[PDB]
Amino acid sequence: MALYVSPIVSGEVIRSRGGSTSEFTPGYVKPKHEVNPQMTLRRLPDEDP
Amino acid sequence: TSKETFTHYQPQGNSDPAHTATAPGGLSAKAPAMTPLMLDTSSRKLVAWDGTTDGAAVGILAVAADQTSTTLTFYKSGTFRYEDVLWPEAASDETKKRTAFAGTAISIV
Fold this sequence. Notes:
Chain B: It comes from Escherichia phage lambda. Chain B: Pfam families: HDPD (PF02924). This is part of a larger assembly, with chains A (49 residues) and B (109 residues). Helix content of chain A is 0%, strand content 0%. Chain A has no helices and no strands. The radius of gyration of chain A is 35 Å and the shape is rod-shaped. The termini of chain A are far apart. Chain B is mostly beta strands and 109 residues long. Chain B has a single domain, classed as Virus Head Decoration Protein, Chain: A (Beta Barrel), CATH 2.40.300.10. The N and C termini of chain B lie far apart (35 Å). The chains are: A little secondary structure (49), B mainly beta (109). Chains A and B meet through loops of A and loops of B.
């Protein structure tokens, strides 16, 4: 706060702030799937007969 | 009849800056502004200057405080007009009061 100080006896000063830092580096994911090259000769549950 | 004399109020006597500082106080009575202070030899708190212990002057009170106050803000530099400082009654000679604050930054004009 700045409680009372009168404009004759001006005094204490304030401080600047800061001082936090953190690093969270890597991450990764890769869900590979297959194509089934020989499953396409039949019919899917879709594609009405 | 009733002529109110409007006068100014200039405690300063020179263009010197009036720097301030905060220090604990152990005063035992009401103290108005511009009262000399001394450092207690036992507890090293700031009390009202007795006007007899030579060389004990440490500064000039700036904002009035009392025995219930814990920290006082007092001047530590500059020059003050001799007629505005509330000298203690124990000091009865002008010369000793004038040179009482020599050594520090405080001076009397």
